[PDB]
Amino acid sequence: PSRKAKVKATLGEFDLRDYRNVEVLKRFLSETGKILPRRRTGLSGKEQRILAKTIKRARILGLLPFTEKLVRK
């Protein structure tokens, strides 16, 4: 049930409010460009709420995607 090491574990310190850290933010998006749930992010209510605001900033800047196509099916 979504158990493959939460994205927070496999990662170090990072400014959750930094909308430019693509290499870090990129981690919180799925195969698609969708924001991973908390079961996967591992973040907390308060953290996750800031992740979202951050990511949505990245997207508008073009640094991050809104949607991805799935390779398989």
Partner 1 sequence: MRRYEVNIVLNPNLDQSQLALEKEIIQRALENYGARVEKVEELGLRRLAYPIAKDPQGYFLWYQVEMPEDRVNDLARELRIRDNVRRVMVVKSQEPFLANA
Partner 2 sequence: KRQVASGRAYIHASYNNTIVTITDPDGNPITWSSGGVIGYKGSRKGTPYAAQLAALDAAKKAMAYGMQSVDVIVRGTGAGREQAIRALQASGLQVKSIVDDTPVPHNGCRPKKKFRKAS
Partner RNA sequence: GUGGGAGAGGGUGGUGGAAUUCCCGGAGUAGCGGUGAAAUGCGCAGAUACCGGGAGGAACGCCGAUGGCGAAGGCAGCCACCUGGUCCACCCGUGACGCUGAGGCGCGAAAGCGUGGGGAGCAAACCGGAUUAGAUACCCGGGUAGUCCACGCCCUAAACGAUGCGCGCUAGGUCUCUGGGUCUCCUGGGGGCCGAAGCUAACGCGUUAAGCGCGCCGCCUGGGGAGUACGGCCGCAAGGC
Residues that bind partner 1 (CB under 8 A): 8, 11-20, 33, 43, 47, 50, 57, 59-66
Residue 15 contact among partner 1, partner 2, RNA, none, beta carbon within 5 to 8 Å by kind = partner 1
Strand-pairing partners, residue 5, are none
What lies within 8 Å, CB to CB, of 73 at 6+ separation is: none
- Give residue 1's identity as a one-letter amino acid code: P
Task: Single out the residue of 26, 48, 63, 71 in contact with RNA (rule: CB under 7 A).
Answer: 48
Residue 63 contact among partner 1, RNA, partner 2, none, beta carbon within 5 to 8 Å by kind = partner 1
Distance between the two ends of the chain, CA-based, in angstroms? 21
